[PDB]
Amino acid sequence: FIIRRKPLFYTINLIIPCVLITSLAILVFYLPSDCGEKMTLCISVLLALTVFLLLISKIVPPTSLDVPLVGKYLMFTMVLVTFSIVTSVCVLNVHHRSPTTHTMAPWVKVVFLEKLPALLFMQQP
Amino acid sequence: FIIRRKPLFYTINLIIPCVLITSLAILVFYLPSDCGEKMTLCISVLLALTVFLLLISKIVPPTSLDVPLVGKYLMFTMVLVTFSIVTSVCVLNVHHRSPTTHTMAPWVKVVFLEKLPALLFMQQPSVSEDWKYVAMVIDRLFLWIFVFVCVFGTIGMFLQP
Ligand SMILES: [Ca+2]
Ligand code: NA
């Protein structure tokens, strides 16, 4: 019995929400550190991805023979979002530094204030 | 009937999310107190660990003969995260102290502003800023403690596979 699933229903109800949630995984790096909302954003994205992964596993259970590509994508994005949480913690720590508590090494200057911005087309005013 | 489980499904569905969540259990101590988001992170980690523990409880039989090693690790991590929440509350309280409202004892000076920073390799480069530095020394101290206590946690989890 060769049968071919009609994919519109699951497309609409699973793939589009998953794509929408995944698209938000990168916005934490454009959010300014002064807003005080980076952690909320990345943690919410991770929670949504985890819930979607568990639901997918309930619908189509992954197995050693084959893992759904959608589940694999969700897991990869979950790992990326955890990495983004770590990176945002580090960036927030760097942002809230003052001469009264930290001293900037000369190499930090020559790299981050001079060279790296040039590669990224930033040009500190 | 000696049967062996194929662990891929539960690996993907419980282990990887659990380790991903646990890897965030020590970040609260590297988070500046001015970001105003230590509580968010630590509370989120605690609740995520609790949810996964409850899911595991729903999977395994409700028998009291033995405890899953993964459940044991989750319980240990939740205890650690609760300790970290308490420590973060204390550090936040310390950070927001000012000369008008609090007076800093001489022993607090000689300890936190002089001795401990040397031990932790901090090297301090107005009085309100001293309170802020004390809070930064306290959570640096616990960052070392949790790393050692957590890194030795892998020993417990390295005997399961
Ligand atoms: Ca806020
Ligand atoms: Na919530």
Swiss-Prot record, chain A:
Residues 56-69 are extracellular. Coiled coil: none annotated. Residues 34-38 are cytoplasmic. The chain crosses the membrane at residues 12-33, 39-55, 70-94. It is found in: Synaptic cell membrane; Cell membrane. Component of neuronal acetylcholine receptors (nAChRs) that function as pentameric, ligand-gated cation channels with high calcium permeability among other activities. nAChRs are excitatory neurotrasnmitter receptors formed by a collection of nAChR subunits known to mediate synaptic transmission in the nervous system and the neuromuscular junction. Each nAchR subunit confers differential attributes to channel properties, including activation, deactivation and desensitization kinetics, pH sensitivity, cation permeability, and binding to allosteric modulators. Neuronal AChR is a heteropentamer composed of two different types of subunits: alpha and beta. CHRNB2/Beta-2 subunit can be combined to CHRNA2/alpha-2, CHRNA3/alpha-3 or CHRNA4/alpha-4, CHRNA5/alpha-5, CHRNA6/alpha-6 and CHRNB3/beta-3 to give rise to functional receptors. CHRNA2:CHRNB2 and CHRNA4:CHRNB2 nAChR complexes exist in two subtypes: LS (low agonist sensitivity) with a (CHRNA2/4)3:(CHRNB2)2 and HS (high agonist sensitivity) with a (CHRNA2/4)2:(CHRNB2)3 stoichiometry; the subtypes differ in their subunit binding interfaces which are involved in ligand binding. Belongs to the ligand-gated ion channel (TC 1.A.9) family. Acetylcholine receptor (TC 1.A.9.1) subfamily. Beta-2/CHRNB2 sub-subfamily. It is linked to Epilepsy, nocturnal frontal lobe, 3: An autosomal dominant focal epilepsy characterized by nocturnal seizures with hyperkinetic automatisms and poorly organized stereotyped movements. This is Neuronal acetylcholine receptor subunit beta-2. It comes from Homo sapiens (Human).
